[PDB]
């Protein structure tokens, strides 16, 4: 699943790889579930899709907190922008 | 690029879609750049790859803050876990 | 995501399409998470991946019950084979 | 497999073989079902519907195997399958 | 699902498209099921995979017979080569 | 091209893999060539595409005969259904 | 299958598209068949794969001749390099 | 890039593979460039796309001549059909 | 990942590979971000996406400069065409 | 080939899209050609592959100049970094 051979990757790089792809997959799931909630024509199914969608957000947040704790620049950039006021850019 | 016809998706759902796939691509970029930093055998290139990696992290954080401000569940779950000290589970 | 024009598909066919891919999505997550749990060298991360892994199993089970309730043959085949003993073939 | 088999347990690799099989049957059910709706030939429609329902059978068989070889599969399947009332309230 | 717009495709062409991809997908399943039978280290799973494998062959055979009945060249070439003896390339 | 490591696949299994994917590729070619025959607005091109289409059918039939001769249940199931009359679901 | 919408593509451009991808698919088939001919351990199959391989070359040549006849730059460049002697880069 | 392990493929088979996929790439570029020439609304870009397109045709022809010189059946079939007059089904 | 085995590649060829794909991915992001800038209906998001778009151009430009310094024909062709007045098809 | 419907994209954005993908595919060809040049064991093919490789570099440079002329931030960032000396990070 990695793009360079494992033999040349540090342990810490492969562990961050596992978390990042996990966040990606959860993000993708949130997006698709959200679209199916809008498009679904069965309310029972919609309730399931909406419930699962929100748990995927939880999974992404958990794995993202791990990344923050194990990468100096994730912690720096997240602290800069998350739970801030005014223009997100400046 | 969406999985459902745009005609059945709310406008707010499609804007969150644009943010989500933006974070995904930045995350993918961080991961690939990080691997090339480890595998690179040219110091000049490694410096570029490491610099760009760190800005991709910035892009993800910026877009993720937007999601936090425009989706209550993102805001709830991000508030629970982010900047916590202690077991994540 | 449908392979046929939506104009010709019954609603229940498209809703089952949404449910089936949801199960597929979750099953893929279960498998990948499980492999990362084995391969991970950080216990903290492993705890997260194992927790998420088991909730994906929950998502699949929820969506599969919906399929059981909205498809006569899903219900027949799930009734035949699930929660049984002995050879799974011919049972 | 997304990790090298050298670090995966044999039980993990067997569940991988089962999970992928359920996925492929689920995908076949979905595609067959759509072609049944779209087919304009009576004899083809009958074949596709016959195969569709056997793909459900394949998935159910392999899904039972997972139930017997993974405690959490057994737990979550037991919670939700063959129930009445809201699926999101259980 | 098709390469050209459905507007310009004849009806029979789209039906044969549905049959062909069904044969393709069944063949793909036979191959993957067969490889997992060799690699599986669990006898109960191996029995399931082998059972499903052979049913996929039946699905492929059914849909291929439909193709034979609805396409003159499928019927001709399948008549030339199937159930024959001696070098296949010969006939 | 195989899903499992060659270390664990029987020789015969890999040869059937080579035949199966060959039939798949020819079938895909038949399908796409046929769609291009319908859509083409150049008769010279249509004549080539139709000629190639029918030879891809020949390739598939040839490779399928080999599978029939080297796999018992290919032979059984093909014998049941091919060159028959009445409903195929039988 | 078209990178751009058909509404803006001239019909001649889409016809050349159909020929180009046909040649591409045949080239891919030649390559794969040739690799399977080398790796196969069953002579009967090898003979079939080798036969099919060479007919795929014929399909590519046929469709390529059509391109030569319907594109002036295909004709120019195919005339420069095909059936020549000496370094290809210097012809 | 190869569908079989390099250990069982002859040297010359792998070289023809490198030539074939190169022609495939060139053909793909020719097609896409041509489509962008039709859809482009900027004359400067269209001039570039058309110039690059025609050089991709040159690349394909060069590599194709190499195949002709290193594969007897390529030489046979190209000799049969190229630079001819009359129906291409000949 | 690479197409040829890493055992037949020079160390420089693989480093240029690492540079090229970085440019490709940066270019892809510029294109996608720019399309989202046009389609977005939320000004906040539009400002973020437009900001990220322009930083991707820097990533592409930086990595492209590295290629110029590490490949003779990149230096030649980039010297010929970039920062020039007149038609690009004649420089 | 665009990710948003062409109805919501400005005309100039789609023209830059056509240029960008052209540069991307040209870069992709350069990379693959370069790897085949290293791995090829036939000198005559290597000479062809190396020649085509360098013309792909030319195509990318041409299309890249057009982008520089039709996008203010491409012109800014390319001016900053191309044809410089010292560390590219600063
Ligand atoms: Ca997924
Ligand atoms: Ca036009």
Numbering used by the authors:
A (entry chain I), F (entry chain E), H (entry chain C), J (entry chain B): 7 to 96
B (entry chain J): 7 to 95
C (entry chain G), E (entry chain F), G (entry chain D), I (entry chain A): 7 to 97
D (entry chain H): 8 to 97
Q: What text comes from the article?
A:
Our study reports on a new class of ferritin-like proteins (EncFtn), which are associated with bacterial encapsulin nanocompartments (Enc). By studying the EncFtn from R. rubrum we demonstrate that iron binding results in assembly of EncFtn decamers, which display a unique annular architecture. Biochemical assays show that EncFtn is active as a ferroxidase enzyme. While EncFtn does not store iron itself, its association with the encapsulin nanocage suggests that mineralization occurs within the cavity of the encapsulin shell (McHugh et al., 2014).
Through site-directed mutagenesis we show that the conserved glutamic acid and histidine residues in the FOC influence protein assembly and activity. Analysis of each of the single mutations (E32A, E62A and H65A) made in the FOC highlights the importance of the iron-coordinating residues in the catalytic activity of EncFtn.
